[PDB]
Amino acid sequence: RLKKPFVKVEDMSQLYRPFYLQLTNMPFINYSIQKPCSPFDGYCECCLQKYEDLETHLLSEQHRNFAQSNQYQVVDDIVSKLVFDFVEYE
Amino acid sequence: GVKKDIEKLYEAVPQLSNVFKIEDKIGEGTFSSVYLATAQLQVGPEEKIALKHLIPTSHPIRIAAELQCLTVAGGQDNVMGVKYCFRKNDHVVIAMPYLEHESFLDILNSLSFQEVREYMLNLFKALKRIHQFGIVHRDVKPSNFLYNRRLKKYALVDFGLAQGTHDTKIELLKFVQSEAQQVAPRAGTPGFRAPEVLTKCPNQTTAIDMWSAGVIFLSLLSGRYPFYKASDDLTALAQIMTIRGSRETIQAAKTFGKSILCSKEVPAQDLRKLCERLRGWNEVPDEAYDLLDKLLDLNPASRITAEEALLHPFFKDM
Ligand SMILES: O=C1NCCc2[nH]c(-c3ccncc3)cc21
Numbered sequence: 031r032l033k034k035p036f037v038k039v040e041d042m043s044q045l046y047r048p049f050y051l052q053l054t055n056m057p058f059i060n061y062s063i064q065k066p067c068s069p070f071d072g073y074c075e076c077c078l079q080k081y082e083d084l085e086t087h088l089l090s091e092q093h094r095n096f097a098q099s100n101q102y103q104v105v106d107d108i109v110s111k112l113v114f115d116f117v118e119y120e
Numbered sequence: 121g122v123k124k125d126i127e128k129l130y131e132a133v134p135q136l137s138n139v140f141k142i143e144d145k146i147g148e149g150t151f152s153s154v155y156l157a158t159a160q161l162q163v164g165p166e167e168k169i170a171l172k173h174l175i176p177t178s179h180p181i182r183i184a185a186e187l188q189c190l191t192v193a194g195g196q197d198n199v200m201g202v203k204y205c206f207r208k209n210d211h212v213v214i215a216m217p218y219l220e221h222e223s224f225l226d227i228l229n230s231l232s233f234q235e236v237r238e239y240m241l242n243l244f245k246a247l248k249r250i251h252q253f254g255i256v257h258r259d260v261k262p263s264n265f266l267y268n269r270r271l272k273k274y275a276l277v278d279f280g281l282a283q284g285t286h287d288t289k290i291e292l293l294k295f296v297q298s299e300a301q302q303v304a305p306r307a308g309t310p311g312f313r314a315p316e317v318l319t320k321c322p323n324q325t326t327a328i329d330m331w332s333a334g335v336i337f338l339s340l341l342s343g344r345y346p347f348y349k350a351s352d353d354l355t356a357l358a359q360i361m362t363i364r365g366s367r368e369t370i371q372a373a374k375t376f377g378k379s380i381l382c383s384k385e386v387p388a389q390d391l392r393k394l395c396e397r398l399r400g401w402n403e404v405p406d407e408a409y410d411l412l413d414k415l416l417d418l419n420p421a422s423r424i425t426a427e428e429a430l431l432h433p434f435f436k437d438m
């Protein structure tokens with residue numbers, strides 16, 4: 031049924047839709063290509079939303095709220111347990 | 121150019137101005153960027169410091185999770201530790217002692233065979249260490265393993281992608297979701313990912329890091345990097361089947377719940393001939409390939425472990 035060459039991976043317990051790879055050619059090990067060549071030669075986790083341009087998303091109020099919230103306390107906790115040892119200038 | 125980046129880093133985390141003379145950007149990546157800086161230590165000497173600026177879209181648990189790995193496991197056995205960390209809202213910067221390091225591509229075809237044993241030796245120390253805490257690194261590759269050839273010093277870095285074993289001694293790792301479920305998991309490099317990861321296996325153990333170490337060793341033995349050049353997971357798998365055999369891969373994947381179909385059967389390769397043809401280098405002992413074979417065990421249950429690897433005959437007498 032599937033044009034060749036192909037690879038199919040199925041979860042044996044149905045926990046997944048199968049997924050597929052179809053290529054022109056299967057990989058082939060090229061011993062002739064020169065060293066060191068291979069012989070085979072977004073999303074904000076905070077706001078749980080995709081974006082296109084980071085710069086703008088960072089200024090958006092959804093993000094600016096989170097950025098300014100109390101959420102970073104778990105970071106803060108780990109941090110206030112380390113020992114500062116650099117010189118700080120005024 | 122980078123002048124703007126640097127300037128903006130000071131704009132982002134005001135407190136850095138007090139402490140660091142930021143000299144240069146040394147790396148960029150999907151999830152962070154790394155700068156070189158100089159600071160003064162209360163104890164007297166001036167220190168070179170790497171500043172890793174995380175991407176402000178990072179979840180707080182992910183940030184804290186990375187940081188906790190560095191605090192608990194880091195600072196010992198060729199694992200990177202942490203001096204201090206600075207935040208200003210969503211901008212976090214981790215400070216680390218700085219290790220001047222080589223490009224892998226560079227030293228690749230110039231290391232003596234002895235330096236290869238030493239390199240592998242030192243990478244398994246690091247993985248023994250993180251594995252004791254139940255840390256699954258998930259992005260072991262040469263660029264995350266800093267090597268200074270002159271000083272013979274080593275350092276595993278980057279826990280920005282880590283997960284825990286179900287019994288992790290690292291509390292925050294338990295809040296990181298696995299790719300199997302779809303905080304969010306972070307994608308790693310296809311060419312260093314083990315077949316159980318490529319096939320989306322819900323059970324993912326520290327064995328996945330051992331396979332990655334195998335791939336590194338394959339590159340060292342064969343003189344080729346990147347060994348597996350693939351941009352998606354299945355391409356990577358198809359390349360693996362070309363090396364380790366499609367039958368062998370199909371069988372092994374049955375043991376972890378995955379049914380793999382492949383339309384072109386390809387036999388397993390002898391690892392010695394493969395590496396020799398792709399290339400102390402006159403008398404590479406059998407033990408080397410034997411170890412590579414155990415690292416690139418298609419079965420994650422039988423794959424050799426970091427502490428087992430350190431006892432391999434390949435490593436007498438060190
Ligand atoms: O955490 C990191 N992720 C990607 C690359 C990287 N390089 C360093 C690094 C470099 C030199 N000295 C300390 C840390 C750290 C990191």
Ligand SMILES: [Zn+2]
Pocket residue numbers: 074076077078087092093096177
């Ligand atoms: Zn956001």
